[PDB]
C-alpha cells in the first residue's frame, strides 16, 4: 500500500484486536519487544486483504454460526464454497470446456474408437489463454448426458439454468442479444472454485481439460 488514507482507516480497526494484553493487565507500559509474538498469528490471516474494507467485525462472526460441519467457508473466499443445485452444479463444469476447446477435436471424450493422429503427443499457443470461445447450444445438449450417472429428461426446469444464470453473472453474452435459433454464450469465472465443488459430489475435472495432456 502507498496512500495515507488507507492506513488511517485500517489502523483503527486493528486497535480492538491488539489492545487485549493492555486491558487484562498482563503487559505493562513500554514493551515493544514482547507484543509482536502474540500478534504475529493474528496478522497472518489479515495482511493478504489489502484495499478491501470488507474485513471488519463480520468476518469471524460467520464461523460462530457453523458449529455443525465447519467445512463451509463464509467470509474469507466465500465464493469457493456456495450452495448449488444438483443438476445446476454440472452446468458451470460442462460449459467451462465448451469455451476453451475446438469445435472439432471433441470426439476424444465420447467415441474412443476413432483414429488419433498424435499431433505432438504448440504448448505455448493462444489456446485456453485468449478467453472464452463462442459456443452455441448444440454443445451443451451432448455433454451433460455423459457427466451425470443415470438419464435425465430435459423438462422445463432443465433449461431454466441457462437464463437464470445470466442474472447471477456466471456467463456472458456475445455482445448484442440474439434471436432464438440457438444463441451463443461464453464464460465468466475460471476454475478457481470448480475444484472445490467437484471434491464434494465425487468428481474430477483436472483429467478432463484439453490443455493439460
Amino acid at each position: 500500500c502507498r496512500d495515507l488514507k488507507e492506513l488511517r482507516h485500517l489502523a483503527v480497526l486493528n486497535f480492538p484486536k491488539y489492545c487485549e494484553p493492555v486491558v487484562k493487565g498482563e503487559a505493562s507500559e513500554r514493551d515493544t519487544r514482547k507484543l509482536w509474538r502474540n500478534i504475529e498469528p493474528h496478522l497472518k490471516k489479515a495482511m493478504q486483504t489489502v484495499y478491501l474494507r470488507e474485513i471488519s467485525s463480520s468476518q469471524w462472526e460467520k464461523l460462530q454460526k457453523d458449529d455443525t460441519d465447519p467445512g463451509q467457508l463464509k467470509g474469507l473466499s466465500a465464493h469457493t464454497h456456495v450452495e448449488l443445485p444438483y443438476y445446476s452444479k454440472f452446468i458451470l463444469i460442462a460449459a467451462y470446456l465448451a469455451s476453451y476447446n475446438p469445435a472439432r477435436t471433441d470426439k476424444r471424450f465420447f467415441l474412443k474408437h476413432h483414429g488419433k493422429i498424435k499431433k505432438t503427443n504448440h504448448e505455448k499457443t493462444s489456446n485456453h489463454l485468449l478467453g472464452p470461445k463462442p459456443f452455441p447450444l448444440d454443445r451443451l445438449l451432448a455433454i451433460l448426458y455423459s457427466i451425470v450417472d443415470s438419464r435425465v429428461a430435459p423438462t422445463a426446469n432443465i433449461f431454466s439454468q441457462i437464463t437464470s444464470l445470466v442474472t447471477l453473472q456466471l456467463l456472458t453474452l456475445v455482445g448484442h442479444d440474439d434471436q432464438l435459433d440457438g444463441p451463443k454464450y461464453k464464460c465468466t469465472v475460471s476454475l478457481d472454485f470448480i475444484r472445490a465443488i467437484a471434491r464434494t459430489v465425487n468428481f474430477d475435472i483436472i483429467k478432463y481439460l484439453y490443455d493439460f495432456l
Binding site: R108, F109, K112, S146, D149, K207, Y208
Partner: peptide, 26 residues
C-alpha cells in the same frame, strides 16, 4: 484391472461402479 487401463479415465466410473461385485473377492 488390466483391461480398464487401456481406455479413457472418464469411462472408468461406468465399469468399476457397475462391476463392483466382481472386483471384490476373497
Amino acid at each position: 484391472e488390466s483391461f480398464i487401463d487401456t481406455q479413457k479415465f472418464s469411462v472408468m466410473r461406468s465399469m468399476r461402479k457397475t462391476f463392483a461385485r466382481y472386483l471384490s473377492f476373497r
